[PDB]
RNA sequence: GCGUACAGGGAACACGCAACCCCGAAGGAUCGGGGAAGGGACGUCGCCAGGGAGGCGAUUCCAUCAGGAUGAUGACGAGGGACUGAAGAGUGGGCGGGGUAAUACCCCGCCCCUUUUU
């Protein structure tokens, strides 16, 4: 918890296979990436983080 | 796979129960915060890989 | 009276606190910004104001 | 917030009275020239606030 | 067959005079133009092979 | 007799039997030339037509 | 990612464009609509030779060291209430001195332009 420093290409083999990664930041947006098994579900998507609230 | 977009000071449950969280950005470094349980872990790369294959 | 040449995303307070900052900078125009408590006032071009004031 | 967009020169008040002014900028550099009495304080966030804030 | 890698505009001639070239690209859509003489039965991809199957 | 649209490789047979069909787009250049019969004489892109113009 | 000379009070991002995703009930021709979002996208830009098929080149505090905690530090006289500063280069412009038979050019003390120093 609250790794700072970790550099715009860096950071391979984190959490347990599932390598989140940055990958360009461009001012106060920063692109970040999951690269997780196909078994394991990501949602971001708001709408879908609501649904994932209610059902 | 690329997430399109997490700004400052949002982020609240994305993937499974790990909330990978962006805490701002002082230049072109970040700040990530993740709050994965506690037997789980998260060390950085491969460096500590090899540290452990190599002990 | 000329406290500080300021950077680029320097400060984060000047002066008292009324949080002045900067922030965003193309060439010789520079977006001067303030945070402060809304009760009190900013304007641009306060000619009419000054005006106003005197009716 | 992000309320005016001042080139170099281009205004000498700035709000209410309390004289925050901009008075030359050097580039990337902006110099803060203020007119504040002696009864009120003008600081920065710097080293000497640290000192501000130890002491 | 896989005769690959034109750039934008940069092939003329495929096989005999049919004079098939590539525009553009935006996204995926890539926009593929044909220039041919019409007395040949060109047309769009399999929905016109099967309105001719049925036909 | 320019369709502006083309998705990448959902055709086998476009037209008669000369079956353009994409397979792979990065930058701006674009794979192209598949399953053409072997009979006619093929080549690019457009340097090799000169060599047998200057046959 | 690129332009704005524009513009008014409380929106850490105002207008084009590009860029991306989807539909066509779509054609003999660079045809329309929608949005700031959605889905598995190991992201951006750039070049080379060929045939029943695929390969190559460059990337941002690149400032370090450390954790499982809304961390430490490395960066300007080194801090300033006089409308404050100090140091270093360069493009130029004027003055005076030197590189001295002499002319032109190039360095040095002084003032303005650009740029560097949390």
Redesign the interface.
């Known amino acids: 918890?609250?790794?700072?420093?970790?550099?715009?290409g860096?950071?391979?083999?984190?959490?347990?296979d599932?390598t989140?990664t940055?990958?360009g930041?461009k001012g106060?947006?920063?692109?970040?990436?999951?690269?997780?098994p196909k078994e394991?579900?990501?949602?971001?998507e708001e709408i879908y983080?609501r649904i994932?609230k209610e059902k």
């Open positions: 918890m609250l790794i700072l420093t970790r550099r715009v860096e950071t391979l083999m984190v959490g347990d599932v989140v940055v990958l930041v106060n947006q920063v692109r970040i990436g999951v690269n997780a394991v579900a990501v949602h971001r983080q994932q």
